[PDB]
Design a protein around this nucleic acid. Structure first.
Ligand code: ZN
Ligand code: ZN
Ligand code: ZN
Ligand code: ZN
Lengths: 70, 72
DNA sequence: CGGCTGACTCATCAAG
DNA sequence: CTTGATGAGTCAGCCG
């Protein structure tokens, strides 16, 4: 019952994937607007409830890898 | 906290107006369905929790007079 | 209906 | 102060 992107409690199947609400609207914002997020680490940041704001780049990558799409 | 159309307990701002769930669904089917509504009295019916089922014409008219709009 | 999911809005924070 | 990112809340269509 866990968000496949950040492991928060999932609220439902959004854009094809079991995710929480915050990840649902994160993906929609990221897929429409500008694209160029930059990772400050090595593109494998830990994305969980407490750290998901740190790296949009890695959070967006995980959304794609889990299969989110419009 | 009461539906502006039938005075039943309101549920939220629906189609631009504070209304109940039943009136919300009624209004959308009225706007979009093929509907020959005719009042059996004087186009001035009492519309409440029970009587709203009797006169869809007056119920509709009240929906529109209250401001409901599917675009709102 | 009411469950499901998407669109939209707004308060709160971080940054500058 | 302003700007931008975040996430919670409300209400929309659709479906059964
Ligand atoms: Zn998540
Ligand atoms: Zn990263
Ligand atoms: Zn009502
Ligand atoms: Zn009537």
């Amino acid at each position: 019952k866990l968000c496949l992107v950040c492991s928060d409690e999932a609220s439902g199947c959004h854009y094809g994937v079991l995710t929480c609400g915050s990840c649902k609207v994160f993906f929609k914002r990221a897929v429409e607007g500008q694209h160029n997020y930059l990772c400050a680490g090595r593109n494998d940041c830990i994305i969980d409830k407490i750290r998901r704001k740190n790296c949009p780049a890695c959070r967006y990558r995980k959304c794609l890898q889990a299969g989110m799409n419009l």
